[PDB]
Design a protein around this ligand. Structure first.
Ligand SMILES: [K+]
Ligand SMILES: [Mg+2]
Ligand SMILES: [Mg+2]
Length: 135
RNA sequence: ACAU
DNA sequence: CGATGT
């Protein structure tokens, strides 16, 4: 119904899908960029959406912040809830980096606690998520 | 179908 | 138009 402005918003950006993947997190109210991941040579949109949420969880936990996280990705929200990223991306030499990060993100979820609400950004009602890459 |  | 996902 109402945007929770006191929140962190995350999004992926890519060149190709699968392709080069990056992600970032922003203050929903101001758009200030709070973190940005260096581009990963090959990944999928959903792997990047997933890593962005988990990075957000770790970022907020380290800062003792109880703000929620917004993502526009139905898929990534579910993967985080399940602590399991059910990607179809082949595991080979060229995808090793993204899969290492995904494996490590699952491992973090399996060894840490958090109460952060992970909320669906309602693009149809509110426009593009504030972390969007505009592409 | 819906979400990207 | 193509791909990633539930
Ligand atoms: K974009
Ligand atoms: Mg997105
Ligand atoms: Mg976007």
């Amino acid at each position: 119904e109402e945007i929770i402005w006191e929140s962190l918003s995350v999004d992926v950006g890519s060149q190709g899908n699968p392709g080069i993947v990056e992600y970032k997190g922003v203050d929903t109210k101001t758009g200030e960029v709070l973190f940005e991941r260096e581009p990963i040579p090959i990944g999928t949109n959903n792997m990047g959406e997933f890593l962005a949420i988990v990075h957000g969880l770790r970022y907020l936990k380290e800062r003792n912040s109880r703000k929620p996280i917004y993502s526009d990705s139905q898929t990534a929200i579910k993967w985080v809830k399940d602590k399991k990223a059910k990607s179809t991306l082949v595991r080979n030499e060229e995808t090793a980096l993204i899969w290492k990060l995904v494996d490590e993100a699952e491992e973090w979820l399996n060894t840490h606690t958090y109460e952060t609400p992970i909320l669906k950004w309602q693009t149809d009602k509110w426009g593009e998520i504030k972390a969007d890459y505009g592409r």
